[PDB]
């Protein structure tokens, strides 16, 4: 296991798992929701999300260790089914290794210069959200402390932001309680459906 | 003994040392490369222009000199 001191900020084109690679091992992370997966929208009002600052690459093993630390702090703080954490970031960039000493100068040189797939990292833009935790109104500081414990573990500099939106949807929490009741937004599981006015009349007849 | 393989560095400057030239001068364009049926038209048309153009063009020149 080579350190993250050598696999670093983006210097090559994205090389994903596809028909052309066919040699990547399995990634470290497999799941992405840890809290109440079947949580309704009105259950957990607010959310805090972890904003990046450096154009870096985050590894899947770092994502594993960070989601384990955040899950452990959430189940110590607010217990089971009192939070919902989602890792927004998904690993697709496959790094390459050029290993040697398979201890003398007599194995190869720089003859075969193309490498073998070692692991999977994820390219992170500036301002891209790493993780997002939705909880109650009184659990404002616990989300901050959990994302701080993830901040001590991710490399580089990144900040925290408690969102103006209502959880994972793209709609504002200030207009949410006013606008889900009258006309438009209907709860669909953990997501929210937005109806336009460009529908057939049978949808409006089935509603109201 | 590995050497440098291929480059186009320091090439546009050598191109513009002497001022890359348009052909820039073709009056009465060349005629080779054109349809042989069209050439069987045009050569017979030119030699009968050389033969039978005298009297009608002469009377037309006299008529336009009289009318202008």
């Amino acid at each position: 296991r080579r350190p993250a001191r050598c696999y670093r900020y983006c210097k090559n084109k994205p090389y994903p798992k596809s028909r052309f690679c066919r040699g990547v091992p399995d990634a470290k992370i497999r799941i992405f929701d840890l809290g109440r997966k079947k949580a309704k929208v009105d259950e957990f009002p607010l959310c805090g999300h972890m904003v990046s600052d450096e154009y870096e690459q985050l590894s899947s093993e770092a994502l594993e260790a960070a989601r384990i630390c955040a899950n452990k702090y959430m189940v110590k703080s607010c217990g089971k089914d009192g939070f919902h954490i989602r890792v927004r970031l998904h690993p697709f960039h496959v790094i390459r290794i050029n290993k040697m000493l398979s201890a003398d100068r007599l194995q190869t040189g720089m003859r075969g210069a193309f490498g073998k797939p070692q692991g999977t990292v994820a390219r992170v833009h500036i301002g891209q959200v790493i993780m997002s935790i939705r909880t109650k109104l009184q659990n404002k500081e616990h989300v901050i402390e959990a994302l701080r414990r993830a901040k001590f573990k991710f490399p580089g500099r990144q900040k925290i932001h408690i969102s103006k939106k209502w959880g994972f949807t793209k709609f504002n929490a200030d207009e949410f309680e006013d606008m889900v009741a009258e006309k438009r937004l209907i709860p669909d599981g953990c997501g929210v459906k937005y109806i336009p006015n460009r529908g057939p009349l049978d949808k409006w007849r089935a509603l109201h | 003994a590995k050497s440098k393989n291929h480059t186009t560095h320091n090439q546009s400057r050598k191109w513009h040392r002497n001022g890359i030239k348009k052909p820039r001068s073709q009056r009465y364009e060349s005629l080779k490369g054109v349809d042989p049926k069209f050439l069987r038209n045009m050569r017979f048309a030119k030699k009968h222009n050389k033969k039978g153009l005298k009297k009608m063009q002469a009377n037309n020149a006299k008529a336009m000199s009289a009318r202008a």
Binding site: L201, W204, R205, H208 | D35
Partner: protein, 294 residues
């Protein structure tokens, strides 16, 4: 619950063509029929479009431009009562007759009347129109049978034979006229003249008058209810071809105007559409207010 029928199919649907979705063109034969070779730059390629429809057939000669197809001349089957042939408007005789009318009308429009008589006496041979030196040459035209399958006996070839006997130089073969035997390669001209004059359907009228008069009164009703007898048909088409070749001038109709119309239902405006929507909203609110209580 089963199929994933239409999600982005409408968004990635490439429409074929207006006339192809109507089912009137193919364009794989039109790209070769229409387009003139570029050594001429202006010379129109004259095409005799022969379209067979129910109750009428159409025979035209047209060419093409980039704006649209310019029609040089046209002829229809429904004017044959005005040109002599009262009944039988979609037969092989009407095809030959419409081709002869179209050829005589085109040569009358071009003024090539006295020369290029063509074939006056209908014989059914392979009469090919030749060009006369010192005179304007023959009219070079090419066929358009359209989407119809060109089997031997199709009356698009009868319209072709009418155009050729009228004097339109169209290159053609004799192995698709009716009367050409499939096994024996020899062509029969007497059968083709018989099929121009329409004596086989005269034999079928004799067959109906001998076998079963019930079908003879069921079909062929306009024939027997004005007048049709086979000797008068054999004289009637022979008089009709001469009556067309003596007067192809196509006297038209005046058609000034009749300023009376209410047929097409016009569109409705944006405000009218939105107020239909608003009345539907108000009526459903009235339904939810009234019928849920009552």
């Amino acid at each position: 619950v089963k199929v994933v029928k239409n999600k982005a199919y409408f968004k990635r649907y490439q429409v074929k063509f207006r006339r192809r979705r109507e089912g009137k063109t193919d364009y794989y034969a039109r790209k070769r029929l229409v387009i003139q070779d570029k050594n001429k730059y202006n010379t129109p390629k004259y095409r005799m479009i022969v379209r067979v429809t129910n109750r009428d057939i159409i025979c035209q000669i047209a060419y093409a431009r980039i704006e649209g197809d310019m029609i040089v001349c046209a002829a229809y089957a429904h004017e044959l009562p005005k040109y002599g042939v009262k009944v039988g408007l979609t037969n092989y005789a009407a095809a030959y007759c419409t081709g002869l009318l179209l050829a005589r009308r085109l040569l009358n429009r071009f003024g090539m009347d006295k020369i290029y008589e063509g074939q006056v006496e209908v014989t059914g041979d392979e009469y090919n129109v030749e060009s006369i030196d010192g005179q304007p040459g023959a009219f070079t035209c090419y066929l358009d049978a359209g989407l119809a399958r060109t089997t031997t006996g199709n009356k698009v070839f009868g319209a072709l034979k009418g155009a050729v006997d009228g004097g339109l130089s169209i290159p053609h073969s004799t192995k698709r006229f009716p009367g050409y035997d499939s096994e024996s390669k020899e062509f029969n001209a007497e059968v083709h003249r018989k099929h121009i004059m329409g004596q086989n359907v005269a034999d079928y009228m004799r067959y109906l008058m001998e076998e079963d008069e019930d079908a003879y009164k069921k079909q062929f009703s306009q024939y027997i209810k004005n007048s049709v007898t086979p000797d008068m048909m054999e004289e009637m088409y022979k008089k009709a071809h001469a009556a067309i070749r003596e007067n192809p001038v196509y006297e038209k109709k005046p058609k000034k105007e009749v300023k009376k119309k209410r047929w097409n239902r016009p569109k409705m405006s944006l405000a009218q559409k939105k107020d239909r929507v608003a009345q539907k909203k108000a009526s459903f609110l009235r339904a939810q207010e009234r019928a849920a209580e009552s």
